[PDB]
C-alpha cells in the first residue's frame, strides 16, 4: 500500500536504454549551461572594465575642466595688462590656445559617449545571458532527477555496475 512512479519503461533493457538517453541529454544541457556561464563571467568582467574606464574618462575630463578654470582665472591679468601696450598677438595666441584646449575636450566627451553606448549594449547582453541560463536550469535539473530515478530503479532491480557504466558512457 505505497506508491511512486517516475519511471516510464518496465523491462530492464528498455529502462537502461532510456537511462542512456537521459544521461546523454543531461551532459549536453550541462555543456550548454557551462558555455553560457563562461559568457556570463566574461561579460561581467568586461562590463566592470568598461565601468572603470568610464570613471577614467570622467576623471580626465575633470582635469580638463580644472585646466579651463585656471586658464580663465590666470589669463585675466595678461589680456588686460597687455591691451595697454598693444600686444594683440598675446591675446590672439592665448585665446586660440584656449580654443585648442576646448576643442580637445569635445573629442574626449565623444569617446566617453561611445563607451557608454557599448556598456548599455553589453548590459543588455548580460541580462539575456542570465535570461537564457534561467530557462535552462529547469531542463537541466529535471534531467538530473530523471537520470537519478532511472539509476535507482535499475540498482534496486539488481543490475550490475558494468551494465550501468556502459549506459552512462
Amino acid at each position: 500500500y505505497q506508491q511512486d512512479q517516475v519511471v516510464k519503461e518496465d523491462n530492464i533493457e528498455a529502462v537502461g536504454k532510456k537511462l542512456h538517453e537521459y544521461n546523454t541529454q543531461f551532459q549536453e544541457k550541462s555543456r550548454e549551461y557551462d558555455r553560457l556561464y563562461e559568457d556570463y563571467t566574461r561579460t561581467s568582467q568586461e562590463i566592470q572594465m568598461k565601468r572603470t574606464a568610464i570613471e577614467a574618462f570622467n576623471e580626465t575630463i575633470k582635469i580638463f575642466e580644472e585646466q579651463c578654470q585656471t586658464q580663465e582665472r590666470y589669463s585675466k591679468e595678461y589680456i588686460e595688462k597687455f591691451k595697454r601696450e598693444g600686444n594683440e598677438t598675446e591675446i590672439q595666441r592665448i585665446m586660440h590656445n584656449y580654443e585648442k584646449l576646448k576643442s580637445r575636450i569635445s573629442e574626449i566627451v565623444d569617446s566617453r559617449r561611445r563607451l557608454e553606448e557599448d556598456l548599455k549594449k553589453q548590459a543588455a547582453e548580460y541580462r539575456e545571458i542570465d535570461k537564457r541560463m534561467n530557462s535552462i536550469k529547469p531542463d537541466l535539473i529535471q534531467l538530473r532527477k530523471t537520470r537519478d530515478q532511472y539509476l535507482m530503479w535499475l540498482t534496486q532491480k539488481g543490475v550490475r555496475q558494468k551494465k550501468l557504466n556502459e549506459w552512462l558512457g
Partner: protein, 935 residues
Amino acid sequence: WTKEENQSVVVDFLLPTGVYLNFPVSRNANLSTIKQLLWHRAQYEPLFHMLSGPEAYVFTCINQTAEQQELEDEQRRLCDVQPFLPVLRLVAREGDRVKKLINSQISLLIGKGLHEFDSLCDPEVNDFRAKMCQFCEEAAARRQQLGWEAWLQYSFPLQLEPSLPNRALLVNVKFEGSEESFTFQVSTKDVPLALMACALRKKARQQPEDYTLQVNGRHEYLYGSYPLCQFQYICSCLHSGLTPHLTMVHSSSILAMRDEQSSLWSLEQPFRIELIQGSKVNADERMKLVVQAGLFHGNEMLCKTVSSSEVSVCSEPVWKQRLEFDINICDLPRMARLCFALYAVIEKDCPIAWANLMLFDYKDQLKTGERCLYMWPSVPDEKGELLNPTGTVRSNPNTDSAAALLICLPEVAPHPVYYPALEKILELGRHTEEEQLQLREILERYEHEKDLVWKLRHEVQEHFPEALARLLLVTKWNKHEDVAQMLYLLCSWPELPVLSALELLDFSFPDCHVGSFAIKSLRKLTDDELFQYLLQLVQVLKYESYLDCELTKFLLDRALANRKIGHFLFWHLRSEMHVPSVALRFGLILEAYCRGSTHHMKVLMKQGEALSKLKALNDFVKLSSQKTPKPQTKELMHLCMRQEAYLEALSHLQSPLDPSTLLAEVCVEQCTFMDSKMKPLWIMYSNEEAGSGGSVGIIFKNGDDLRQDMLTLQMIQLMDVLWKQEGLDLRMTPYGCLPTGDRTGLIEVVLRSDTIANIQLNKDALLNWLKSKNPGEALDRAIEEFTLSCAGYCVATYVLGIGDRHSDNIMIRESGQLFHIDFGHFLGNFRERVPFILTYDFVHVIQQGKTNNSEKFERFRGYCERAYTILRRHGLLFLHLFALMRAAGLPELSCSKDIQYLKDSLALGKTEEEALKHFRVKFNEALRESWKTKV
C-alpha cells in the same frame, strides 16, 4: 595598446598657466625625456616666461584604474605608466609625496583602485581601513628601529630542513667586492658562527660576530644556533656532492638594505521581515516568481523556512508581504543569517538567484530599515538545497546590472538594540556513572546523543576538552539561554592543540567566540608550520561574516613579522582579485599589508609587471601559433622580448615562486613555449653571482587554473615533511607552483629532466638512460634515488587519488629522482577508487635490471608501507585541511564525499594492523596487475 606598440603617441600637455600643447612622442620615451621635449616646445607657446624650471614640476596622469597619479619616478617609460588617455598635467612638486605615492602604487599593485572602497560609502570598510592600516603602519615603524639581527630574521627567515651524520666536506667562502676566494675544510655539524671566524683568518692586513654568511646568487642567509647540515643549501650541496659557495657580508651592509623609510533579551516579539520588490529579474514570462527565505546559524536552521505568493514573472515584481518566522528577536544568536532565494515555479523548479544577510551588523547592532540585497546567480549542483546558507554575506558588486531584492526589517524599539556584551552573557550563564560510560562511548567514536552531551557539557570541558567541536554542534543556537551557557564554558575552555583548532575554523562554527578561540590556539604556530597551512587559512576568510575579524588580524600579524609569509599571503590574495565574491575583502587586506610593507611592495611591483608583460607575450605567441609554424613563432617571440621595455621588465626580479631565488638575466635564445593547449611560455634565467646549476627556469601559464596543482604540491610537500620527521627521505620533487592571476600562474622548471615518454621514445631504455647520466659507481645512487621517489610518489598518488597517470606526465631527474606533474584531476576524478599502481618498467629499474631481486624489492615494499603508515598517523590533519579547502570552490573538492575519499584511501575507520593488511593486498594486486598491463 601600450604593452606591445613601439610607435609614437600624440600626448596632451597641460601647463599650469592654462596653456595646452599637443605633440607626438615615443611610447618607449621616459618621463624625464618627455619633460625636456615639452620645455623645448613650450618656449614657442604663450606664457613660457612665468613657468619655473622643469625640475619644479611633476607629471600627473589618470592611470589604468581610474585614479590620479603623481609620476614622481621620471625614469619610467610612458608605455610602463599606461595612462588611460595620453594626457600629462604639470603640477607643483611639493606636498606630502609619501602618502600620495604609496596610495597610487597600492592601487596599481592590488588591481583595484582605492577610490572604489570610498565610493561604497560603507562604515565597515572605512573602519577596517582606518584600524588595519594604522596597525600595519605601526608594525612597520616598530620594525625599522630594531637591529640588523632582527631585520635579517624578518627579511630573510631561515630555510632549514625538518631534521644526522658528522662527516666533513670542504666549503668555498669569499667576501663582498673581492675577486679572490678561500676554500677550506669544514664538518657537516659546525655552527655558522664558527665558520665565519675560520674565514676571517684571511692572511692570519691584521671580528666574525659583525657578519653573516650569504649563499651567493640568492637571498639565503646561514645564521643562528643551527649546525651547517640542518640548512637546505648545505644539505642540498652535500647530497648532490657539490661544493657550497658562500659569502661573508658586513653588519653595515645589511643596514644598507634595511634603511628604506616607511535589553535585547526583553524583546520576545517574533522575528519578521517586509518583502517589497524584486529588480532586474531575468526569467521566462510564462512561469511565476516565489521567494523562499530562511534564518541560519552556520549550517543548521534556526526555524522553519517561510515562502511567498506566486507573483507573475517580470523585471520588477512586487510583493509587499510580511514574512513571520518561528523564532523571537531575543532568540536570535550573534551570527544569525537571513538567507533568500528567488525561484521560478509553475502556478499550479528553477532557482534564479540567492542572497544572504547578517541580522546584526559589525558593531553588534540589530539592523533596522530597508536593505537592497543585490543577488547572486544560483548555479545548480548535485545537492541542490533550497537556500544557500554557506554562500557569502557580501553584496554583488555588479550593482548596475545584477538582480536585487528590496526588503525592510522592522523597528523593534525607539532606542536601537545591540547583542549583549560578554559580561552580561557570562552573567546569565554561570547558572563511574551510567551517564559517564555513555558519553565516553559517544565521544570515543544523533538526536538522543545530542541531548545527553548537552546535560553532561561540563564533564566534556573537564574530561573531554578535545571534543569541543562536537559540543558546539549539539548546542541549540535558536534559544539564547542555551547559547549563553555554551559561551560561558567556551571562555574558560582549556587551550587545544593546533590540529583541533584547524577543525574549529570551518563554516560549521560561525560564532566569533569560537573563531577567536581557534586563532588563540594557532598563535603557538611556527612560521614553517604556519606556511604549511597558509593556503587553507586564506580560503577560510571567504566564510567570514564581517571584514574586521581575528583571522585577518592573525594573518596580517604573521605577514608583517615574516617576509616569506607576507609574500605568499600577497599572491594568495592577489590571484583572486578578479573574483567578485572576495575582491572587496581581499583588496582591503592587500592594502593593509602593503602599508606595513612598503619595502616588499617595491619587489612585488617588479613581479607584477613581469607577469603583465608575460601575459601579453603569451597572447602574441598564442595568436602566432595559429597563424605560423613554431620555429618562426619562436623567433618572433624573441624579437618581442628584445624590446627594452620587455627585457628590463622581465630582468632582475625576485621570483614569485621563491623570493630568495633571484631571476637576473633572461636567456632569450633558451626561451621558448611548450606544445600544449594553453601554449605556456618557457622562460630561462641566469645570474653571474651564482655558482653551479644556478640557471633557473619558470613556466608562465595563462588559460588554465593552477590552484588544483598547487594544493596537490602543497600536500606532497606536507607528506615529505611528515616523512622527513621520521627520518625517511624519499627524494621528492615538490616543485614551485603559484597562481598569480585570472587563470594565470607560474610553475617552477625542474632542470636536468625529461618525460618517460621521451626517454622511452628516443634512442629496457629507462635503465639505459640512467646509465648515461650516472656512469659506473654513480649508477647505484640513481637506483636508490629512483626507488625512494618511486615509493613516495606511489603512496602520494594513491592517497590523493590522482588518476590519469601516464608516460608523458611522469618525469625523471638525471639524479635518478622520479616525480609526477600536471595534477588536474584528483580524489578519484577524471568518482571511483583509483587503485594503487606499480609499473613494470619502474619495478625493472628498482630490481637493477634483474628478473628477481627480492632483497631490493622487499626494501621498496618497506618504503611504501612505512610511508603509507606515517600518513595515517597524521590522517586528521589531511581531513581538517581538505575540509577548509571546500571554501576555495574547486570543482573536484566541493563536499563530504570528496573528503570521504581521503578517509577511505587512508583507511582511517579501520585499525592500523587491519589497514596495513589491506594495503599489502592492494600492493600485491598492483604487482600482479603490473605484468598483465604491459602485454
